[PDB]
Scaffold this motif. Structure first.
Motif, PDB file in Angstrom:
ATOM      1  N   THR A 135      45.209  29.027  30.218  1.00 33.32           N
ATOM      2  CA  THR A 135      45.997  29.576  28.291  1.00 33.32           C
ATOM      3  C   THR A 135      45.351  29.113  27.033  1.00 33.32           C
ATOM      4  O   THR A 135      44.668  27.806  27.916  1.00 33.32           O
ATOM      5  CB  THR A 135      47.135  29.776  28.288  1.00 33.32           C
ATOM      6  N   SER A 136      45.570  29.344  26.002  1.00 29.53           N
ATOM      7  CA  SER A 136      45.547  28.087  24.924  1.00 29.53           C
ATOM      8  C   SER A 136      46.635  27.087  24.825  1.00 29.53           C
ATOM      9  O   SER A 136      45.624  25.654  24.903  1.00 29.53           O
ATOM     10  CB  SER A 136      45.567  29.158  23.654  1.00 29.53           C
ATOM     11  N   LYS A 137      47.330  27.482  25.557  1.00 31.99           N
ATOM     12  CA  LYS A 137      48.339  25.661  25.760  1.00 31.99           C
ATOM     13  C   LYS A 137      48.111  24.768  26.657  1.00 31.99           C
ATOM     14  O   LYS A 137      47.807  24.099  26.671  1.00 31.99           O
ATOM     15  CB  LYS A 137      49.911  26.549  26.075  1.00 31.99           C
ATOM     16  N   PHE A 138      47.753  25.121  27.416  1.00 34.63           N
ATOM     17  CA  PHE A 138      46.873  24.808  29.071  1.00 34.63           C
ATOM     18  C   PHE A 138      45.649  25.173  29.631  1.00 34.63           C
ATOM     19  O   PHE A 138      45.162  26.194  30.439  1.00 34.63           O
ATOM     20  CB  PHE A 138      48.186  25.349  30.884  1.00 34.63           C
ATOM     21  N   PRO A 139      44.167  25.297  28.782  1.00 33.16           N
ATOM     22  CA  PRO A 139      43.290  25.222  29.107  1.00 33.16           C
ATOM     23  C   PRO A 139      42.521  24.495  30.653  1.00 33.16           C
ATOM     24  O   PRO A 139      43.416  23.178  30.899  1.00 33.16           O
ATOM     25  CB  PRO A 139      42.493  24.635  28.098  1.00 33.16           C
ATOM     26  N   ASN A 140      42.090  24.914  31.422  1.00 32.38           N
ATOM     27  CA  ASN A 140      41.391  24.632  32.385  1.00 32.38           C
ATOM     28  C   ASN A 140      42.369  23.903  33.920  1.00 32.38           C
ATOM     29  O   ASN A 140      41.842  22.527  34.297  1.00 32.38           O
ATOM     30  CB  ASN A 140      39.993  23.995  32.656  1.00 32.38           C
ATOM     31  N   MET A 141      43.584  23.963  34.077  1.00 29.46           N
ATOM     32  CA  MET A 141      44.439  23.329  35.138  1.00 29.46           C
ATOM     33  C   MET A 141      44.512  23.826  36.231  1.00 29.46           C
ATOM     34  O   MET A 141      44.183  25.026  36.151  1.00 29.46           O
ATOM     35  CB  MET A 141      46.207  23.376  33.981  1.00 29.46           C
ATOM     36  N   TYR A 142      44.164  22.955  36.856  1.00 29.89           N
ATOM     37  CA  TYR A 142      45.298  23.172  38.382  1.00 29.89           C
ATOM     38  C   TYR A 142      45.866  21.935  39.005  1.00 29.89           C
ATOM     39  O   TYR A 142      45.843  21.255  38.181  1.00 29.89           O
ATOM     40  CB  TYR A 142      43.749  22.824  39.114  1.00 29.89           C
ATOM     41  N   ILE A 143      46.295  22.349  39.714  1.00 33.16           N
ATOM     42  CA  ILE A 143      47.540  21.873  40.654  1.00 33.16           C
ATOM     43  C   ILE A 143      47.642  22.209  41.696  1.00 33.16           C
ATOM     44  O   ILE A 143      47.352  23.424  43.261  1.00 33.16           O
ATOM     45  CB  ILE A 143      48.591  22.681  39.961  1.00 33.16           C
TER      46      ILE A 143
ATOM     47  N   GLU B 103      53.733  40.849  23.877  1.00 31.63           N
ATOM     48  CA  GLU B 103      54.685  39.948  23.298  1.00 31.63           C
ATOM     49  C   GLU B 103      55.701  39.532  23.481  1.00 31.63           C
ATOM     50  O   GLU B 103      56.443  38.886  22.833  1.00 31.63           O
ATOM     51  CB  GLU B 103      55.903  41.873  22.195  1.00 31.63           C
ATOM     52  N   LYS B 104      55.768  39.097  25.264  1.00 34.06           N
ATOM     53  CA  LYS B 104      56.370  38.195  25.813  1.00 34.06           C
ATOM     54  C   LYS B 104      55.719  36.923  25.554  1.00 34.06           C
ATOM     55  O   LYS B 104      56.459  35.882  26.445  1.00 34.06           O
ATOM     56  CB  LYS B 104      56.660  39.135  26.831  1.00 34.06           C
ATOM     57  N   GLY B 105      54.471  36.859  25.033  1.00 34.81           N
ATOM     58  CA  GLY B 105      53.462  35.188  25.235  1.00 34.81           C
ATOM     59  C   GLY B 105      52.562  35.860  25.818  1.00 34.81           C
ATOM     60  O   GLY B 105      51.551  36.423  25.660  1.00 34.81           O
ATOM     61  N   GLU B 106      51.588  34.484  25.830  1.00 34.40           N
ATOM     62  CA  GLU B 106      50.511  34.205  26.333  1.00 34.40           C
ATOM     63  C   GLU B 106      50.317  33.860  28.148  1.00 34.40           C
ATOM     64  O   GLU B 106      51.338  33.028  28.673  1.00 34.40           O
ATOM     65  CB  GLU B 106      49.809  32.888  25.906  1.00 34.40           C
ATOM     66  N   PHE B 107      49.458  35.018  28.911  1.00 38.25           N
ATOM     67  CA  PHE B 107      49.412  34.205  30.623  1.00 38.25           C
ATOM     68  C   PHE B 107      48.087  34.376  30.872  1.00 38.25           C
ATOM     69  O   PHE B 107      46.911  34.886  30.801  1.00 38.25           O
ATOM     70  CB  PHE B 107      50.447  35.893  30.688  1.00 38.25           C
ATOM     71  N   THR B 108      47.932  34.015  32.132  1.00 34.86           N
ATOM     72  CA  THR B 108      47.070  34.080  33.186  1.00 34.86           C
ATOM     73  C   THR B 108      46.970  35.220  33.516  1.00 34.86           C
ATOM     74  O   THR B 108      48.033  35.724  33.976  1.00 34.86           O
ATOM     75  CB  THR B 108      47.325  33.049  34.099  1.00 34.86           C
ATOM     76  N   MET B 109      45.887  36.030  33.733  1.00 38.72           N
ATOM     77  CA  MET B 109      45.840  37.383  34.131  1.00 38.72           C
ATOM     78  C   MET B 109      44.334  37.092  35.153  1.00 38.72           C
ATOM     79  O   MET B 109      43.537  37.508  34.662  1.00 38.72           O
ATOM     80  CB  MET B 109      45.594  38.756  33.330  1.00 38.72           C
ATOM     81  N   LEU B 110      44.788  37.727  36.155  1.00 33.84           N
ATOM     82  CA  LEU B 110      43.882  37.580  37.487  1.00 33.84           C
ATOM     83  C   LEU B 110      42.935  38.938  37.301  1.00 33.84           C
ATOM     84  O   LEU B 110      43.463  39.921  37.391  1.00 33.84           O
ATOM     85  CB  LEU B 110      44.697  37.491  38.817  1.00 33.84           C
ATOM     86  N   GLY B 111      41.804  39.006  37.398  1.00 33.57           N
ATOM     87  CA  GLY B 111      41.064  40.114  37.111  1.00 33.57           C
ATOM     88  C   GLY B 111      40.443  40.512  38.876  1.00 33.57           C
ATOM     89  O   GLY B 111      40.203  39.200  39.518  1.00 33.57           O
TER      90      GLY B 111
ATOM     91  N   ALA C 134      39.281  27.395  44.063  1.00 30.19           N
ATOM     92  CA  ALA C 134      40.276  27.524  42.999  1.00 30.19           C
ATOM     93  C   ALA C 134      39.182  28.040  41.023  1.00 30.19           C
ATOM     94  O   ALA C 134      39.749  29.260  40.179  1.00 30.19           O
ATOM     95  CB  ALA C 134      41.012  26.650  42.860  1.00 30.19           C
ATOM     96  N   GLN C 135      38.389  27.502  41.265  1.00 29.08           N
ATOM     97  CA  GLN C 135      37.687  27.195  40.046  1.00 29.08           C
ATOM     98  C   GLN C 135      36.762  28.503  40.223  1.00 29.08           C
ATOM     99  O   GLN C 135      36.130  28.960  39.346  1.00 29.08           O
ATOM    100  CB  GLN C 135      36.549  25.669  39.539  1.00 29.08           C
ATOM    101  N   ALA C 136      35.884  28.121  41.250  1.00 25.32           N
ATOM    102  CA  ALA C 136      35.152  30.306  40.768  1.00 25.32           C
ATOM    103  C   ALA C 136      35.688  31.511  40.733  1.00 25.32           C
ATOM    104  O   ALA C 136      35.186  31.955  40.144  1.00 25.32           O
ATOM    105  CB  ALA C 136      34.493  30.042  42.555  1.00 25.32           C
ATOM    106  N   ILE C 137      37.448  31.310  41.213  1.00 23.74           N
ATOM    107  CA  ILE C 137      38.011  32.403  40.796  1.00 23.74           C
ATOM    108  C   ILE C 137      38.368  32.114  39.535  1.00 23.74           C
ATOM    109  O   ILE C 137      38.110  33.191  38.718  1.00 23.74           O
ATOM    110  CB  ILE C 137      38.990  32.868  41.231  1.00 23.74           C
ATOM    111  N   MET C 138      39.093  31.443  38.779  1.00 24.26           N
ATOM    112  CA  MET C 138      38.886  30.922  37.807  1.00 24.26           C
ATOM    113  C   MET C 138      38.221  31.352  36.379  1.00 24.26           C
ATOM    114  O   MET C 138      38.367  32.265  36.029  1.00 24.26           O
ATOM    115  CB  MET C 138      39.580  29.694  37.168  1.00 24.26           C
ATOM    116  N   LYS C 139      36.446  30.837  36.455  1.00 25.50           N
ATOM    117  CA  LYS C 139      35.297  31.140  36.308  1.00 25.50           C
ATOM    118  C   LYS C 139      34.816  32.672  36.019  1.00 25.50           C
ATOM    119  O   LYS C 139      34.492  33.162  34.788  1.00 25.50           O
ATOM    120  CB  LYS C 139      34.277  30.313  36.805  1.00 25.50           C
ATOM    121  N   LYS C 140      35.538  33.235  36.964  1.00 22.14           N
ATOM    122  CA  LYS C 140      34.465  34.755  36.721  1.00 22.14           C
ATOM    123  C   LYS C 140      36.001  35.651  36.664  1.00 22.14           C
ATOM    124  O   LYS C 140      35.566  36.742  35.840  1.00 22.14           O
ATOM    125  CB  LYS C 140      34.487  34.859  38.185  1.00 22.14           C
ATOM    126  N   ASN C 141      37.232  35.536  37.463  1.00 18.09           N
ATOM    127  CA  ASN C 141      37.639  36.395  37.497  1.00 18.09           C
ATOM    128  C   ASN C 141      39.412  36.139  36.504  1.00 18.09           C
ATOM    129  O   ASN C 141      40.450  36.871  37.695  1.00 18.09           O
ATOM    130  CB  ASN C 141      38.205  36.880  39.390  1.00 18.09           C
TER     131      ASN C 141
END
Length: 182
Positions: free
Chosen positions: A107-115, A22-30, A8-15
């Motif tokens: 996101t700004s609200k939830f940085p570096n969050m893993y569940i 206008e509808k908010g801030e989203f995690t976006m997967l490259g 999960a961390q490997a994906i988050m750190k690079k992708n």
């Protein structure tokens, strides 16, 4: 903490990038080159913010299945000066159930969050905010506002993006290799 969180961390750190519409801030997967995904309810327009930088949208396609049913995935091509690491070889080829998944948000609200969300069901049909939706994955975690676009992984696989919940369960749209053949 373990090899699930490692992948999960490997994906988050690079992708991942932070996408603002206008509808908010989203995690976006490259996914590859300048191609990323976001929930269709983000309502991507001609311009989007990527890590707080004004970015032209070269193309955006709200995916539907061949029954013309919503899939809740928008594929976005960004006018960005840098490519994503190609992770298409980590996408499943077919609809499936999974064990021991992680939902990761940045996101700004939830940085570096893993569940650790545990078992993932091929749920299929969901009435999502009143819209009939197909290819839904379900996990028994009480997910909240701010997690949409979150990446769902297992060790070795990127399987979905978080699109909603009902307070007790969370729901992700499947990612399939066939969406990103070029």
């Amino acid at each position: 903490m373990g090899p699930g969180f490692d992948f999960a961390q490997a994906i988050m750190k690079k992708n991942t990038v932070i996408a603002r519409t206008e509808k908010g801030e989203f995690t976006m997967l490259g996914v590859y080159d300048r191609v990323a995904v976001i929930p269709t309810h983000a309502s991507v327009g001609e311009i989007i913010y990527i890590n707080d930088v004004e970015t032209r949208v070269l193309d955006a396609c709200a995916l539907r299945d061949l029954t013309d049913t919503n899939l809740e995935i928008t594929i976005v091509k960004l006018d960005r000066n840098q490519k994503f690491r190609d992770i298409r070889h980590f996408l499943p080829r077919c609809e499936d159930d999974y064990n021991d998944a992680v939902l990761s948000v940045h996101t700004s609200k939830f940085p570096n969050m893993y569940i650790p969300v545990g078992q993932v069901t091929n749920y299929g049909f969901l009435n999502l905010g009143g819209t009939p939706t197909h290819r839904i994955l379900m996990y028994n975690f009480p997910t909240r506002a701010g997690q949409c676009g979150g990446v769902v992984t297992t060790t070795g696989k990127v399987i979905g993006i978080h699109v909603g919940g009902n307070g007790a369960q969370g729901f992700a749209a499947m990612l399939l290799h066939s969406y990103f053949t070029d």
